[PDB]
Design a protein around this ligand. Sequence first.
Ligand code: B62
Ligand code: B62
Lengths: 265, 265
Amino acid sequence: KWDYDLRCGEYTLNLNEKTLIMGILNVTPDSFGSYNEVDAAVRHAKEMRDEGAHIIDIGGESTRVSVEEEIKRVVPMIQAVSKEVKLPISIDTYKAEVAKQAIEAGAHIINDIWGAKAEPKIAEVAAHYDVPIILMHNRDNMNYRNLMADMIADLYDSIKIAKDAGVRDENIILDPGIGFAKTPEQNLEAMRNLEQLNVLGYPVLLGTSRKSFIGHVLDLPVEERLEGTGATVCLGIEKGCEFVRVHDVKEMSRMAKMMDAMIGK
Amino acid sequence: KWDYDLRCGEYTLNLNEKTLIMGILNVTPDSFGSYNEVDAAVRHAKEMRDEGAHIIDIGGESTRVSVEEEIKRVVPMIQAVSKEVKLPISIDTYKAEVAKQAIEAGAHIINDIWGAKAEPKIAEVAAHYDVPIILMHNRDNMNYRNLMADMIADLYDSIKIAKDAGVRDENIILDPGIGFAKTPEQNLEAMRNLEQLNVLGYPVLLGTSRKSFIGHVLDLPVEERLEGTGATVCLGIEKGCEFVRVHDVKEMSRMAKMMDAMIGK
Ligand SMILES: C[C@@H]1CNc2nc(N)[nH]c(=O)c2N1
Ligand SMILES: C[C@@H]1CNc2nc(N)[nH]c(=O)c2N1
């Protein structure tokens, strides 16, 4: 099915062999590139490498921050993890300068929650270093004529921007952006119609880990969402996703792997 | 989609509203209707009722037993649980006399792992008390020309037997019999083609809890199979199953419920 491998410089990721697990690195800052924060992050990456993660996702601005600062927090982390853990690292920013530094510092993949729309210059950063980029569906509003048709239109506007800036098709990964610009019911509608994004011809990453719509269904707080995340990973894999972005790496790797065996991937 | 409810005398089970969870009652015998065994079983049913189970499944001969004896072990259990826990009880036997007693003692549903083939008289027991019966795929051999086509043929031979004995269509539930008469690869093939059984027009129950094929994929012992069972429950629900038979009632209820929300059931 994929006629190419994901080229990540040093590392290569095969897209046919298994669902690829992206481990979410919790970047809990010190009040002050300090030791407790860089060391707590290195140990966390190591735990996830050992639990079956294939990519470590490192973020500077967690939604729940000055550009100069985001770099000083995230660059030390990427240096320590890329040196100490043999996994590709994706950098979770939408800012072009942050992306630029992160890749100099050793990150392999760009992870852009605004799909090259917040700062179009980021795809030029991608085009240049020639790295894979994740384009996530997002918009600053929630008025959908047709949810899926709109997601697909919007994603396609990211691809144009990326392709225009010089991004090769083989470095494009898409993401339905679950939990962004979507009501809880829209989130479950995007889950139920995820296979639609396959028509765009690109690999899909799904990020549903512990998100608020799981809580809305199950009526359960963020720490009781492991079964609900599992269900979303399972439906995602069955609908064709190539990657899942999760906190619970041990549990999701096992669910991923059993899905893979059953659907014949 | 289902134009009728599952009639269980005292209780009624709706087939459209949610995936219905069947809790597996571990019937750990005393060396001797004793207290520790009937009381350990009542507390276990109660825990599962509280964790979200809709049916309690009670078995006399766990595969890993004289007819007269199977009754003396299982009849006290059904009396205590049906009196003390307000859930329908299914009786996991293939023996007609055991089924007969179990229903006198208070069980609602017959659960027959040999699909009325080991003892055809059991469907007459079903026909008479007018109870729902689960017909599970099983055979005393593993030489399949075409796995799915054979399962469907074999299941259909159970339906004939049941219908001939007087069983109403509305009291027939089918079960692909995962882990019986199937190699590990055949088990994963039946999972991947489960939606095929829907053409027979009946509700489907799936039993994959902690089974040996999960262990074969994940390489993990029976107590580390919770993620692997989850994956099977998720794929089952997406492929259309009306019931899942599980040990981990808390975890599987949550995964069931999140699947239901997403697939729109
Ligand atoms: C809340 C987080 C932020 N970063 C993400 N990145 C991708 N690709 N996909 C996602 O779902 C998310 N969600
Ligand atoms: C091992 C157990 C025995 N009883 C079962 N009954 C049904 N219906 N389905 C099943 O899968 C099983 N498996």
